[PDB]
Design a protein around this nucleic acid. Structure first.
Lengths: 111, 49, 127, 171, 106, 96, 197
RNA sequence: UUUGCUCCACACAAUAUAGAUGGAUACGAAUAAGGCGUCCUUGUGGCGUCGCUGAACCAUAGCAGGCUAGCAACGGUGCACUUGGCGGAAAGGCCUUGGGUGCUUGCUGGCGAAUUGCAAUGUCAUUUUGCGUGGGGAUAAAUCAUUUGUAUACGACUUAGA
RNA sequence: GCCCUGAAAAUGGAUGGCGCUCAAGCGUGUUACCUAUACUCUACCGUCAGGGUUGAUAUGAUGCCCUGACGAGUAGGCAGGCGUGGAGGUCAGUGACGAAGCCUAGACCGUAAGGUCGGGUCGAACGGCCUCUAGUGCAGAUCUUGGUGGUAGUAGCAAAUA
RNA sequence: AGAACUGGCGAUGCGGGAUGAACCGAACGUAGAGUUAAGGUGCCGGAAUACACGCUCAUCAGACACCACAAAAGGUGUUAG
RNA sequence: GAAAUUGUUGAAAGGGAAGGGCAUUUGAUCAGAC
């Protein structure tokens, strides 16, 4: 895996473009506030922007909110992986590991 | 395994192939080298055995 | 003059032929899947023939439609032909192979009266 | 990559028995932020009874040097691993900035002693403030008065594949 | 005058390909005077014609045309990708193609 | 080396022109008949190709045919060959 | 931009020239290479002579006639290098090799046509100064080429008639250059200079 | 052998294209050196200039390039003739004398274009072959069969035969 | 550290090959670019799952429709279908104005098993559908019987005096 | 030859290691577009005869894991300590 | 009155096999639609 600490811009763009909710074991594009409303309205979540809020500021209902969000299907990075060989650690010139803020650049090229 | 005993090979490999000649008159493939000091003369002649 | 239909896609137009039908005479070209342990056709090695599979299944909106857009219905007499009277825009009649010469004249004349398309109005014509 | 000089300060995690730890500092040459923090933990564990889990990083600050235009002459000490042993070394690089000197050193070691990034320790990089304090000849050469030299046999790069006259290397 | 040319000269290089597999759906085109992807961006979307002769008249001529267009650049050296309505024969690798100026952005 | 040109003599005997025939008994014998017309001029024709061999042709060879009729052989068909001249001054090789 | 490109091969590296030319033929360009005897190969003459002798011992054991052919001409040595950089066994590859002619010296009509060079294959630009290089004419002679003296004689003649052509050319271009200078500083010329001409 | 063969001019067909769409535009040599201009006491000379790419030079306006008028110079170009050379590495091309002829956008005028309809390569190149005309040019061999043995398994070879 | 000595095997030959020497080699760094049945989006096919819809007319509610996810496979299991001989039912089915069979680089349907048509030949029987039944599907078993090739106008047809 | 844990081949194609049951990448309905992996970009061959710092001349150079070999011991060859 | 195998005519291709797959040029032929 490759992971890091994501910013508001990265997370906001992900849900808007590639955010899907787990609706009765079905992968449903959000595409409306009522879809989140009828499914996450118990915890005070009423919108796609509210859902992003519970993600970035880890709230009391982050577990349910994150679980509702379907796992994101990303493509390969647009500009490439930045390295000749992926399966070395980021510290060792590779791709895997913790890239503390450079995940934003990587995910945006994927998104 | 090697030949138990040595012997020179039979025949010459520079006269290959042992085919028929292309003509009844053998061709001269080399004439004597020329020095332009002597009078003009033929270098060969034709006769019958 | 058929009911409107989308663009008809075939996804494959070569006839799938059994392996080595080109090689041996005793091997017919009717399709047979290879069950051999070593077969390069069964293991899908590159450069070899493809095998029939459900991915080549046609669209259901265009399945069974001839290029003119009608579905073939075989008719052997007039009574069969009249069952298509309300279905001229979806079905084209096609006279069965064994119908005699004088009977085809009757069907063809009846077909044009009802406006029913016939796919083979050329068989057994004396001309 | 192209190197940047960072200062990294870390300390052991505070506790009730011993709060206010010593806040050790170290200068690191690294391509990016994550490597600078890593190399600090790598080197610190070699001196003190500490590791990444048992301490914290308090600060990181990139150091870009005062005069990116004045040409310096740097004395550099290293410690590197050969195929058979560990050896110390001292050389000079004459260039415009501290980071470019290290960027020269790593290529220089990789070219002469096949020493890759992993097997090299940069001990200290200092400016030779006084000329005639240079002890190696290859950098002492350029310190003469009114230095000047030509560049013979210049090779032009052609855009088109075919040239319509024989090229000339005057310069 | 002597010259009546309204198209840029070009050569048909090959299909899109790996070293052992090719894609006949995409053709590779070299444009004279184009050496960078930056320069080649000017000819994207231009109409490409392959003109060839034959011994049979079809609709009032013995010249047949395979029409195409330029889709994108290819490589660092000004080569571009093109797709034609019918794939180019591949007997014409190194044959010349005409890159017209329409549609125009000037 | 490559033969630039050949210059032949005005008159050729029968025994030499038999070399150019497979069936001598079936012939108008048509041998150098139009070539003999290259001669019978004062200085026009033959001297050019001779001067061609002067201006070029660092090697000069001579076409000779044997007098096979003098020998007791029953052949009647002479043998033609090139014999290279190894004198000097290739111009006078052509003259000789 | 050219129907036929004729290359002055003197002072070129045989492998880099072969690569550049090989691409030209595969792209549809007709090429003629002249003066193959003055081509260079990087490496001391002794090195390149041993390489040919190691090449010379590779032959079909049971019949030398169907074996690899060791061509000794400088034009043929360059041709062998180019054939290896081309898929010569296919129809497209055979078509490419039809667009190539390699000559020794500068024969007729190519003797009155412009010669170009390929700078990325030129020896004075490629090789480091001081490096040792071999000349194909010398190397070919040591392995069996017979026509070093023939070619040198025919180039001594050709260059003499070529210098005669150029001496007349310089006289005429002086006469034209004088006319343009006199025709300069004219109102027509002033407007031309304003437009960059 | 029932009028055959070859070359020249156009007349129409067939045939095919590894791929014209302004010009393949000519010193040699060196590259830690050269090109050009000029001068002299002619050299391994002096002085001046140039490169840092052909992004050059030439050509290039007109119904796919029409029809007419005038002006200025006596140049430019194409074409068929003609005078004299040069070139053999695969020369097969290069230079040159004279006259004729067409055009000339070097400069200033007059007439025509449309409708291929809003683009459709929108057809202008050269390969070979055939059939016709009209105008010259010239009137053979080889094989089988017979025959020799300097040859020979058979083919093949070498001889002979109006 | 690179390079060299150390460094000897048998058909000619292998950084894959050409070939490459401030590399097209070695160490190292930074960008650009190429392309897998992989990843993202879309269409279409099937499978699985979760749902909607008897309301009147129009008949398949095992139907029509909505949503989502998924798809490699030997041995093997299960399921849905194509074809053959014969049997019950039905199409008051086809047919001497040509049944069945055979042939057809002609057309159409189906992913496929297969199905359908046109043309030629032919001469007396044969199908669709719902079911029933089995001596029901072949590329092979040195399979069985029959038939036919390449070998091949080949080996050869020469003991016993003519 | 014999075991332990795990992953694979068997039963599996596809891109790459020229070539290969086992390595690397990645597992597969039929297509289109885009982007990449491992591997690469003189020519074969799609893709920079890219850019930068050094080193090496080899009268058997060197040239990319598995993997298709080379050691001890030596060298005013050359470079840096 | 099938196939293997064969003759004749017609068409096409053929530098040490042939046959196959994707894609298209060319030639021959052809259905649909109007």
């Amino acid at each position: 895996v490759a992971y890091g600490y994501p910013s508001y811009s990265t997370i906001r763009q992900l849900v808007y473009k590639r955010g899907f909710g787990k609706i009765n074991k079905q992968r449903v594009p959000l595409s409306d506030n009522a879809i989140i409303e009828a499914n996450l309205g118990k915890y005070g979540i009423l919108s796609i922007d509210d859902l992003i809020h519970e993600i970035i500021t880890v709230g009391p209902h982050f577990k349910q909110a994150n679980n509702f969000l379907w796992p994101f299907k990303l493509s390969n990075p647009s500009g490439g992986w930045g390295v000749p060989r992926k399966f070395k650690h980021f510290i060792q010139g590779g791709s895997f590991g913790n890239r503390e803020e450079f995940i934003n650049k990587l995910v945006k090229s994927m998104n | 395994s090697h030949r138990k005993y040595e012997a020179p090979r039979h025949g010459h490999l520079g006269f290959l192939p042992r085919k028929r000649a292309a003509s009844i008159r053998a061709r001269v493939k080399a004439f004597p080298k020329d020095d332009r000091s002597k009078p003009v003369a033929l270098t060969s002649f034709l006769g019958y055995k | 003059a058929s009911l409107p239909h989308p663009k008809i896609v075939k996804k494959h137009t070569k006839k799938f032929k059994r392996h080595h039908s080109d090689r041996y005479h005793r091997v017919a070209e009717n399709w047979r899947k290879q069950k051999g342990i070593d077969s390069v056709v069964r293991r899908r090695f590159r450069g070899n023939i493809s095998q029939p599979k459900i991915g080549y299944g046609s669209n259901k909106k265009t399945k069974f439609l001839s290029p003119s857009g009608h579905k073939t219905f075989l008719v052997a007499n007039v009574k069969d032909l009249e069952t298509l009277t309300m279905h001229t825009k979806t079905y084209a009649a096609e006279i069965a192979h064994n119908i005699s010469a004088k009977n085809r004249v009757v069907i063809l004349a009846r077909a044009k009266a009802l406006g029913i398309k016939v796919t083979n109005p050329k068989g057994r014509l004396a001309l | 990559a192209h190197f940047k000089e960072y200062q990294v300060i870390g300390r052991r995690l505070p506790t009730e028995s011993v709060p206010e730890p010593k806040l050790f500092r170290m200068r690191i040459f690294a391509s990016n932020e994550v490597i600078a923090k890593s190399r600090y933990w790598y080197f610190l564990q070699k001196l003190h009874k500490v590791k990444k889990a048992s301490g914290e990083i308090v600060s990181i600050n990139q150091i870009n040097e005062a005069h990116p235009t004045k040409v310096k002459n740097f004395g550099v000490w290293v410690r590197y691993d050969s195929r058979s042993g560990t050896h110390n070394m001292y050389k000079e690089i004459r260039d415009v900035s501290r980071v470019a000197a290290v960027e020269t050193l790593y290529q220089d070691m990789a070219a002469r002693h096949r020493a890759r990034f992993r097997s090299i320790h940069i001990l200290k990089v200092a400016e030779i403030e006084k000329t005639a304090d240079v002890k190696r000849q290859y950098v002492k050469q350029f310190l003469t008065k009114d230095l000047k030299f030509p560049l013979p046999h210049r090779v032009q790069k052609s855009t088109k594949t075919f040239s319509y006259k024989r090229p000339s290397t005057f310069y | 005058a002597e010259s009546h040319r309204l198209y840029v000269k070009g050569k048909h290089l090959s299909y899109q390909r790996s070293k052992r597999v090719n894609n006949p759906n995409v053709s590779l085109i070299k444009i004279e005077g184009v050496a960078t992807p930056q320069d080649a961006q000017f000819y994207l979307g231009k109409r490409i014609a392959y003109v060839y002769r034959a011994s049979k008249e079809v609709r009032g001529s013995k010249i047949r045309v395979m029409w195409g267009k330029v889709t994108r650049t290819h490589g660092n050296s000004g080569v571009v990708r093109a797709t034609f309505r019918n794939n180019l024969p591949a007997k014409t690798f190194g044959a010349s193609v005409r890159i017209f100026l329409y549609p125009s952005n000037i | 080396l490559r033969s630039l040109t050949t210059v032949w003599a005005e008159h050729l005997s029968d025994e030499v022109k038999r070399r150019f025939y497979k069936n001598w008994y079936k012939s108008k014998k048509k041998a150098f008949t139009k070539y003999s017309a290259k001669y019978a001029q004062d200085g026009a024709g033959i001297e050019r190709e001779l001067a061609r061999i002067k201006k070029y042709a660092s090697v000069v060879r001579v076409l000779v045919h044997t007098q096979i009729r003098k020998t007791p052989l029953a052949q009647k068909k002479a043998h033609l060959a090139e014999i290279q001249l190894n004198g000097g001054s290739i111009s006078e090789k052509v003259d000789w | 931009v050219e129907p036929v490109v004729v290359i002055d091969g003197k002072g070129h590296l045989v492998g880099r020239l072969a690569s550049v030319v090989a691409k030209q033929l595969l792209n549809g360009q007709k090429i003629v290479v002249v003066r193959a005897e003055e081509l260079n190969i990087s490496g001391e003459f002794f090195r390149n002579k041993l390489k040919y002798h190691d090449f010379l011992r590779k032959a079909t054991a049971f019949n030398k006639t169907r074996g690899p052919f060791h061509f000794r001409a400088p034009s043929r040595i360059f041709y062998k290098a180019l054939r290896g950089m081309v898929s010569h066994k296919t129809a497209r590859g055979k078509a490419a090799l039809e667009r190539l002619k390699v000559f020794e010296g500068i024969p007729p009509p190519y003797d009155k046509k412009k010669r170009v060079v390929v700078p990325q294959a030129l020896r004075v630009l490629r090789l480091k100064p001081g490096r040792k290089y071999t000349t194909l004419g010398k190397l070919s002679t040591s392995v069996g080429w017979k026509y070093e003296d023939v070619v040198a004689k025919l180039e001594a003649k050709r260059k003499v008639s070529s210098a005669e052509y150029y001496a007349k050319k310089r006289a005429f271009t002086k006469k034209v250059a004088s006319a343009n200078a006199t025709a300069a500083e004219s109102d027509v010329a002033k407007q031309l200079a304003a437009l960059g001409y």
